Amino acid sequence: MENFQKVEKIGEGTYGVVYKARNKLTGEVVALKKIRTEGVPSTAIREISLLKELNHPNIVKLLDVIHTENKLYLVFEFLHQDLKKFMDASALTGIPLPLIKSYLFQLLQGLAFCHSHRVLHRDLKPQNLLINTEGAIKLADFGLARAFGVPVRTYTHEVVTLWYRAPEILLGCKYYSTAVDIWSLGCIFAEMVTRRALFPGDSEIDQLFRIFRTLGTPDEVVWPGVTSMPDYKPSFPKWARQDFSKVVPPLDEDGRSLLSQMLHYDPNKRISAKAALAHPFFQDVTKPVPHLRL
C-alpha cells in the first residue's frame, strides 16, 4: 500500500498478487500478498491472525495481517528463492544428496511443529518452499487453506497444480488430516531426487490414475474404507504396484524406505513428520550451503 514501496512483482500466487516491498519506515524488506472480495469474512481474519503466533525457523514468518478496503494484506518474511526455481537451476547436475536430505529434514521439522499445533498446510508444492543462502528452507502459506478455502483456479484464470495432492483429497474426503502434508512432501522428495515430478497429472482423474499406475490401484487390503470414499468408482482400472527401485532411482534403500512410508495410501498408516525425523535415512544428515545465484 502506501507504507510500502513496491520493489518487484514476486509473482501471482494462488490467493492474489505478491510483491517484494520495503517498509518505508523500518526499512524492512518483506513479501506482501494482496488477498482476493467484499466484506472479508471475520472468521478468516481471526484464523489468519492466529497464524502470526505460529513461529518456527522452518516456517516463513507471518509478520502482519492488514484488513482494509475489501482487500486483505498479508506481510511475510522475505526469502530470495523458491525450491521450484532452485530445482530447475540444478536440473543438469541435480541437487546433491546431502542437501536434499538437509532440506527434507528441515521441512519435516517445520511440519512436525505445525502439526503439533493443529495447523495443516494442505497445498505444499516446490513453489511455496523458500530457501536462503544459509542452507535453510522454510514452508510458506501454512494454514491459509483452512482460514479460507479453494475455488477452481487461483484467483484469476490460473491452473491449480494437482501434482502434490494426496489421494484421499482426490477421492473426495471432506476431512483432511496432517497426513496430506506428508504425502505432498514425499512427492517433493521424489522430485528432488529424480529431477522430474513424480505424479504430473493434468486433471483430477489423470492425477489419481498416475498415482494408481505407480503405486497400484488401492483396495480394501491396503486401504480399509477406500471403496466407500465419495468419489471412488468400482470402475477404476486395476493397476499393479511398481517397485520403488524403478520409481526413484538411484535413491538408496534408506531413502526408498522413508519415501514408501510417506506415500502409504491409508492416511492412518502414513508416517508422521515426528516419526519420519527418526528414520535411519537421517542418521548422517548435515546442513550444506547451496550454491544460489541471486
Ligand SMILES: NC(=O)c1cc([N+](=O)[O-])ccc1NCc1cccnc1
Ligand atoms: N515470502 C516470500 O519471500 C515469497 C512469497 C511468495 N508468495 O507468493 O507469497 C512467493 C515467493 C517468495 N519468495 C521467493 C522469491 C521468488 C521469486 C522472486 N523473489 C523471491
